[PDB]
Amino acid sequence: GYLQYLKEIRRDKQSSVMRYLLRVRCWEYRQNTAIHRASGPTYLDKARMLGYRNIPGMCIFRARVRRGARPKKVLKGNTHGKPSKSGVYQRKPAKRLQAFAEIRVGRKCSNMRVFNSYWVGQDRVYKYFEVIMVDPYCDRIKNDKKINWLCKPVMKHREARGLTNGTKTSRGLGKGIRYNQTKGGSKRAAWRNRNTQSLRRYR
């Protein structure tokens, strides 16, 4: 079917047709304001894996992020302490650049829930992403059977608590001996379980 052909072309990022399209689109994205609404998804296959349908009460927004590492916020390089903690540059953020895009779109579109996000381009200065949003106060959505779950009160601000596809990846969750640092639920949950003194009745 049709969605298979699109997958194979979207994967060939150094084909002549894809180099053409990436160049023209990345030009346009930078002429626009830093967060803006899109007419529809740039990639139909990718948006549909992640749960988009063309029904009322769903939207695509597009966001840009500046590239490279993030320096320490100190004046004149003065850190008032020990020399091993005096480095300013070559310090890399804990979260992906994608996570910043999701966090900023959620502030602007405060009446809606952030579902999922994907990559759409890069250049020397910026990296560009599309975010899928849903409106929980909409009659069409309240009566759906596939995304009606987003209306549960616990689903407010998923992006702020590291629950979305872009924000989750820095937590270090997984199964097996390679992820012992998160047994319990999180890094801090593991810390508590390891740094507690248990004092029974008969002892």
Add this chain to the structure above:
Amino acid sequence: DIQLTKKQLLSMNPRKLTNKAQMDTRKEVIATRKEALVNAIKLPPALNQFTNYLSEEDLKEVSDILSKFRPETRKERKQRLQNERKGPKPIIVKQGIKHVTKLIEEKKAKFVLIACDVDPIEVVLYLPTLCVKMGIPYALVKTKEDLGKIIKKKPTTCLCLCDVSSDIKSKFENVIAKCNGQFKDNYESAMKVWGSPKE
């Protein structure tokens, strides 16, 4: 208020329009400057295909055949279902990318029309190569609206036909021969020439 000239719009820097009042102008600056850029640079062979399309004369000829196989409206559909089944299986023209690609793959389709002005283009990009491999004839049309008018409904990406009534067969065969000339017969040569900047 005032319509700006082409010269003005090409002069303005979009990043310096910032107020809520100015947003419509920002949109127009971007639209015009994009056109100038696309005309300046070379197109790869596959994208260059969608620059070649039927004349308004041929479009008339084709539409004047196809219009006789119009799909049912909801009013018609209701009536049909109150009545009993009668007569032979109808011939109807078919619509939408998902169904069309299935019929090409099953080798059911017999002739296909495709629209050029589609964004993003990656939706239709592969159709000519698939048509050439299955050996099905096709033709390209300028706008999605040209197709909508044939079937008396909303614009679409492509239309398809899988059967021929004997009444129409003579005209049909002639049309296919015209199309093969402009499109399918020329394919292997086309896939090697890059689109020139435009004069």
Add this chain to the structure above:
Amino acid sequence: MRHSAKSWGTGRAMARVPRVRAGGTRRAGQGANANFCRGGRMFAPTNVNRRWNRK
């Protein structure tokens, strides 16, 4: 241990106990945190971790 207190140090002809920072009340300059002070903290405060039962 609630109050804001600090020692006055030597040179004032007073014992170097911590004292309460205040003004406008008779509480100014009184002796704060130690076990030998009125309203101060007890020696070795009693605590829930004691072993209550026996085997």
Add this chain to the structure above:
Amino acid sequence: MKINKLNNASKALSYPVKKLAKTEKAPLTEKQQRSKELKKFAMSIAREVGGLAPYELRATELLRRDEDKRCKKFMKKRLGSLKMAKKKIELLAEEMR
């Protein structure tokens, strides 16, 4: 200390069970075959529409000059894995033939 008393030879012994043979799953139904065919077909069309990438061109050029060991080193540095390099060389070779 109740550790390290047996020799390695006696630790290797085992109880004599009766085994069950594995149920082989070799039959592939008609519909599964068509499914696989269509996927492989789609992969052709992409290559036809968009062509080869820059390092694939450079690689194939070296293969014409019989620069086999240069091509090997080049591909290792591009893809990371010596296994991926060995596979991609074999696919490129077959394309040229």
Add this chain to the structure above:
RNA sequence: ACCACACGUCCCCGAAUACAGCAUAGUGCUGGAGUACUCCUUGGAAUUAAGCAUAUGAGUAAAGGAAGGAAAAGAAACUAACGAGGAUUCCCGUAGUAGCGGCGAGUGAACAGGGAACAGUCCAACAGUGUAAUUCUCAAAUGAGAAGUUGUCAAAAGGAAGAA
């Protein structure tokens, strides 16, 4: 008389708004307060090494963002090499062990074995073509219009128990 349960009335300032951002066919929604406990970032020094610079205190304090009566996690791209087991969380335990460390001071997990409680499922890939069968609005007793082919649409009432 007076009391107890509910309702009616409820001045001015304050998010304080005749506003800002944003969605729908339309109605609208967010903002401030609280934050003991839970999740996500950012990130010290006193102190110990009888000095001190790696290390320690500590991913702790402080500062920011966010939610609920709990929160997070969760059904193996998992362990194991036995004659093997089988989601997540919690308790007893392996263990002050294997190891990390100016191999100094000091740091430091996992499977097993015994229990508490137990439950599994969805989307994409992949929707009737002898007709979008789908959602909404107004009318009407059968018509007009909006969304949608860049793909909509995959079914049950129902009950006596249990607790405060």
Add this chain to the structure above:
RNA sequence: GGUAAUGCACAGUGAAGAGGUGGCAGUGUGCAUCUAAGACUAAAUACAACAGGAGACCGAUAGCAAAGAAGUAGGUUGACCG
């Protein structure tokens, strides 16, 4: 803790449809076990304000700072202090 890289990032580079792992770097080859890059999930677990019940606890210089109109009388230019 993770030791010739346990996890997370940034820049270059960038796959295959078949891939991932088996606590010491590399190359080859059988064998065992799984299926990442989309989502949901009860019970068993943690702890303020407010309410109720108990105690080998304290008894007006004690016990919460506060057993009365107590965060009150009163004080700082102010943050805050009492």
Add this chain to the structure above:
RNA sequence: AGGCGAGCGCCAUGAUCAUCACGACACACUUGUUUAAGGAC
């Protein structure tokens, strides 16, 4: 595929890929010369 000194290195010129200056255009980028000027610096 040519030529020199008791197949060697040395001297000729002919095909194959990058590549450093120099030109001449306009599309990224720059500037209130802005219905404009620069320019792959």
